[PDB]
């Protein structure tokens, strides 16, 4: 049977999906907090060419 194989065993996507979603939200926070990117008395350096960002 294929339905009885997926009526159960489909719950094995929740927790991994949650991990992915949490990583996404952490990236969103990092994006929000970009007001000192390459503007810190330490790590403030001149930018390389083709380097559009010091970090996302």
Partner 1 sequence: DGPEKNYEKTLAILQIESEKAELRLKEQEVRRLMRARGDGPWYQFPTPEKEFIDHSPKATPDN
Partner 2 sequence: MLKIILPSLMLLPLTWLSSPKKTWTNVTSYSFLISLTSLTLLWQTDENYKNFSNMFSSDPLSTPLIILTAWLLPLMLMASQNHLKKDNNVLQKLYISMLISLQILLIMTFSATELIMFYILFEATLIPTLIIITRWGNQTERLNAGIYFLFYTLIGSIPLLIALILIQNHVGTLNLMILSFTTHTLDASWSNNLLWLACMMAFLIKMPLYGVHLWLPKAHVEAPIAGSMILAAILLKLGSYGMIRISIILDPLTKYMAYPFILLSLWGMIMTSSICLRQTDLKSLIAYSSVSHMALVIASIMIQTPWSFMGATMLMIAHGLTSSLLFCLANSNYERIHSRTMIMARGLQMVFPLMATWWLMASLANLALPPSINLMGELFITMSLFSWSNFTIILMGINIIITGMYSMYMIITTQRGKLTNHMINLQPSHTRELTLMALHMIPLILLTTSPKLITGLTM
Position 36 contacts partner 1 (CB under 8 A): yes
What would the 3-class secondary structure string for 10-26 be? HHHHHHHHHHHHHHHHH
Q: Do 54 and 47 contact (CB within 8 A), yes or no? A: yes
> Residues in contact with partner 2, total (CB under 8 A)?
16
Q: Which residues contact 30 (CB under 8 A, 6 or more apart)?
A: 56
23 vs 47 by CB, closer to partner 2: 23
Task: State the nearest-atom distance from the C-beta of 22 to partner 1, in Å.
Answer: 17
Position 6 contacts partner 2 (CB under 8 A): no
Chain residues binding partner 2 by CB under 8 A are 8, 11-12, 14-19, 21-23, 25-26, 29, 33
């Amino acid at each position: 049977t294929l339905f009885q194989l997926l009526r159960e065993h489909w719950v094995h996507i929740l927790v991994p999906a949650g991990f992915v979603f949490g990583c996404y939200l952490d990236r969103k926070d990092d994006e929000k907090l970009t007001a000192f990117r390459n503007k810190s008395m330490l790590f403030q350096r001149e930018l390389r060419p083709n380097e559009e960002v010091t970090w996302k």
